[PDB]
Design an enzyme around this catalytic site. Structure first.
Site, PDB file in Angstrom:
ATOM      1  N   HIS A  44       0.793  -1.245   0.000  1.00 15.79           N
ATOM      2  CA  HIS A  44       0.000   0.000   0.000  1.00 15.79           C
ATOM      3  C   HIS A  44       0.826   1.297   0.000  1.00 15.79           C
ATOM      4  O   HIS A  44       0.315   2.373  -0.344  1.00 15.79           O
ATOM      5  CB  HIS A  44      -1.118   0.001   1.073  1.00 15.79           C
ATOM      6  CG  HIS A  44      -0.664   0.463   2.418  1.00 15.79           C
ATOM      7  ND1 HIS A  44      -0.383  -0.434   3.424  1.00 15.79           N
ATOM      8  CD2 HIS A  44      -0.419   1.717   2.866  1.00 15.79           C
ATOM      9  CE1 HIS A  44       0.002   0.294   4.455  1.00 15.79           C
ATOM     10  NE2 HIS A  44       0.002   1.598   4.165  1.00 15.79           N
ATOM     11  N   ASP A  93      -0.719  -7.451   1.685  1.00 15.30           N
ATOM     12  CA  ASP A  93      -0.068  -6.135   1.779  1.00 15.30           C
ATOM     13  C   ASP A  93       1.425  -6.324   2.021  1.00 15.30           C
ATOM     14  O   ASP A  93       1.936  -6.152   3.138  1.00 15.30           O
ATOM     15  CB  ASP A  93      -0.752  -5.257   2.827  1.00 15.30           C
ATOM     16  CG  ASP A  93      -0.399  -3.805   2.715  1.00 15.30           C
ATOM     17  OD1 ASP A  93       0.168  -3.410   1.681  1.00 15.30           O
ATOM     18  OD2 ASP A  93      -0.729  -3.050   3.644  1.00 15.30           O
ATOM     19  N   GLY A 186       2.521   6.283   8.899  1.00 13.57           N
ATOM     20  CA  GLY A 186       3.951   6.485   8.689  1.00 13.57           C
ATOM     21  C   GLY A 186       4.801   5.292   9.077  1.00 13.57           C
ATOM     22  O   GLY A 186       5.982   5.227   8.720  1.00 13.57           O
ATOM     23  N   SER A 188       3.851   2.091   8.313  1.00 16.65           N
ATOM     24  CA  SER A 188       3.559   0.978   7.387  1.00 16.65           C
ATOM     25  C   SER A 188       4.774   0.479   6.654  1.00 16.65           C
ATOM     26  O   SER A 188       5.682   1.271   6.351  1.00 16.65           O
ATOM     27  CB  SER A 188       2.469   1.333   6.392  1.00 16.65           C
ATOM     28  OG  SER A 188       1.299   1.840   7.009  1.00 16.65           O
ATOM     29  N   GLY A 189       4.802  -0.824   6.416  1.00 20.10           N
ATOM     30  CA  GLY A 189       5.909  -1.437   5.680  1.00 20.10           C
ATOM     31  C   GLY A 189       7.050  -1.869   6.563  1.00 20.10           C
ATOM     32  O   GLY A 189       7.798  -2.781   6.205  1.00 20.10           O
TER      33      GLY A 189
HETATM   34  C1  LIG Z   1      -5.341   2.503   8.626  1.00 16.80           C
HETATM   35  C2  LIG Z   1      -4.207   3.473   9.026  1.00 16.80           C
HETATM   36  C3  LIG Z   1      -4.746   4.615   9.912  1.00 16.80           C
HETATM   37  C4  LIG Z   1      -6.115   4.882  10.018  1.00 16.80           C
HETATM   38  C5  LIG Z   1      -6.575   5.975  10.749  1.00 16.80           C
HETATM   39  C6  LIG Z   1      -5.685   6.806  11.395  1.00 16.80           C
HETATM   40  C7  LIG Z   1      -4.330   6.554  11.305  1.00 16.80           C
HETATM   41  C8  LIG Z   1      -3.860   5.472  10.568  1.00 16.80           C
HETATM   42  C9  LIG Z   1      -3.738   4.183   7.729  1.00 16.80           C
HETATM   43  C10 LIG Z   1      -2.980   3.219   6.798  1.00 16.80           C
HETATM   44  C11 LIG Z   1      -2.522   4.048   5.613  1.00 16.80           C
HETATM   45  C12 LIG Z   1      -3.066   3.860   4.353  1.00 16.80           C
HETATM   46  C13 LIG Z   1      -2.614   4.609   3.272  1.00 16.80           C
HETATM   47  C14 LIG Z   1      -1.629   5.565   3.448  1.00 16.80           C
HETATM   48  C15 LIG Z   1      -1.074   5.777   4.706  1.00 16.80           C
HETATM   49  C16 LIG Z   1       0.079   6.699   4.894  1.00 16.80           C
HETATM   50  C17 LIG Z   1      -0.057   8.052   4.585  1.00 16.80           C
HETATM   51  C18 LIG Z   1       1.030   8.909   4.663  1.00 16.80           C
HETATM   52  C19 LIG Z   1       2.285   8.440   5.042  1.00 16.80           C
HETATM   53  C20 LIG Z   1       3.446   9.411   5.093  1.00 16.80           C
HETATM   54  N1  LIG Z   1       4.671   8.930   5.367  1.00 16.80           N
HETATM   55  O1  LIG Z   1       3.231  10.626   4.952  1.00 16.80           O
HETATM   56  C21 LIG Z   1       2.425   7.098   5.395  1.00 16.80           C
HETATM   57  C22 LIG Z   1       1.333   6.234   5.323  1.00 16.80           C
HETATM   58  C23 LIG Z   1       1.550   4.812   5.698  1.00 16.80           C
HETATM   59  O2  LIG Z   1       1.414   3.892   4.888  1.00 16.80           O
HETATM   60  O3  LIG Z   1       1.787   4.649   6.951  1.00 16.80           O
HETATM   61  C24 LIG Z   1      -1.539   5.012   5.775  1.00 16.80           C
HETATM   62  N2  LIG Z   1      -1.825   2.659   7.572  1.00 16.80           N
HETATM   63  C25 LIG Z   1      -1.980   2.243   8.904  1.00 16.80           C
HETATM   64  C26 LIG Z   1      -1.077   1.323   9.443  1.00 16.80           C
HETATM   65  C27 LIG Z   1      -1.205   0.899  10.753  1.00 16.80           C
HETATM   66  C28 LIG Z   1      -2.232   1.381  11.563  1.00 16.80           C
HETATM   67  C29 LIG Z   1      -2.409   0.832  12.994  1.00 16.80           C
HETATM   68  N3  LIG Z   1      -3.158   1.438  13.891  1.00 16.80           N
HETATM   69  N4  LIG Z   1      -1.675  -0.269  13.413  1.00 16.80           N
HETATM   70  C30 LIG Z   1      -3.155   2.278  11.017  1.00 16.80           C
HETATM   71  C31 LIG Z   1      -3.052   2.704   9.691  1.00 16.80           C
END
Ligand SMILES: C[C@]1(c2ccccc2)C[C@@H](c2cccc(-c3ccc(C(N)=O)cc3C(=O)O)c2)Nc2ccc(C(=N)N)cc21
Length: 238
Positions: A44, A93, A186, A188-189
């Site tokens: 993602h 993912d 932020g 993720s991955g």
């Molecule tokens: C569902 C979500 C979430 C939902 C509600 C509030 C907060 C977070 C969002 C999801 C997501 C999807 C698409 C893009 C981004 C994203 C955007 C910008 C940047 C950047 N660097 O500017 C990085 C990222 C990145 O991929 O993190 C994040 N990722 C994620 C992971 C883990 C948990 C968790 N609580 N364990 C929660 C989440």
């Protein structure tokens, strides 16, 4: 990372920061070193990323402030996304980044061991989630790498917490019933690393959740053990 603390330099040597150059240079996602030319991250993280040319991988980083135009990085030769990937919530993912050059292993940067095919049986008690993600809802990318110890939770228990969703066996969840500690935007991955028999293993990849660190909402991770053949297929290709 919500409710965690500042990491120590060299504490997570497999942890990488994946940066984008266009529009402006910034942290995009976490990742893990798994081979001398391989990063394991989340699919993602590439939404809208039309080229591996805008990517830069930095290893051996504690603080984002260490990164300037003169900082050494690894270029991305190829983005390999799981061909079944549609969205984070549906699974698969997972992605592989083939680096343009070889990572020379040091105490600052080395790989994390993938789970074993016989490690399906094991119960991990010491699991940690790390990243430069948000420590709160409306936040910014953190300077210092953060860490949090989170307990793994069963699939059945995670399914109860996610009514309307389908928690697949290719997913793994981690969280406290009262919340407080979790990965966030932020992170993720990046890895969910578990120490077993004094050996760290890449158990999960940060993927999604309902908000961050909320009560009865454990973070959902890509269950790495379930992708060992897929990883070997992509990395050991003739
Ligand atoms: C569902 C979500 C979430 C939902 C509600 C509030 C907060 C977070 C969002 C999801 C997501 C999807 C698409 C893009 C981004 C994203 C955007 C910008 C940047 C950047 N660097 O500017 C990085 C990222 C990145 O991929 O993190 C994040 N990722 C994620 C992971 C883990 C948990 C968790 N609580 N364990 C929660 C989440």
């Amino acid at each position: 990372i919500v409710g965690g603390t500042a990491s120590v330099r060299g504490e997570w040597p497999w942890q990488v920061t994946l940066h984008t150059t266009s529009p402006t240079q910034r942290h995009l996602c976490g990742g893990s070193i798994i081979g001398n030319q391989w990063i394991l991250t989340a699919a993602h993280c590439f939404y809208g990323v039309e080229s591996p040319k805008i990517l830069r991988v930095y290893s051996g980083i504690l603080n984002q402030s260490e990164i300037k135009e003169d900082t050494s990085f690894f270029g991305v030769q190829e983005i390999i996304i799981h061909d079944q990937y549609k969205m984070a919530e549906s699974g698969y993912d997972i992605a592989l980044l083939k680096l343009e050059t070889t990572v020379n292993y040091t105490d600052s940067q080395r790989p994390i061991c993938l789970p074993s095919k016989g490690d399906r049986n094991v119960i991990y008690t010491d699991c940690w989630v790390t990243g430069w993600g948000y420590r709160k809802l409306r936040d910014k990318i953190q300077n210092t790498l953060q860490k949090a110890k989170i307990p793994l939770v069963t699939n059945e228990e995670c399914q109860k917490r996610y009514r309307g969703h389908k928690i697949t066996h290719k997913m793994i969840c981690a969280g406290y019933r009262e919340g407080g500690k979790d990965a966030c935007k932020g992170d993720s991955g990046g890895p969910l690393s578990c120490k077993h028999n004094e050996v760290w293993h890449l158990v999960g990849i940060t993927s999604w959740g309902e908000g961050c660190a909320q009560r009865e909402r454990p973070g959902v991770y890509t269950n790495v053990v379930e992708y060992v053949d897929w990883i070997l297929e992509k990395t050991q290709a003739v």
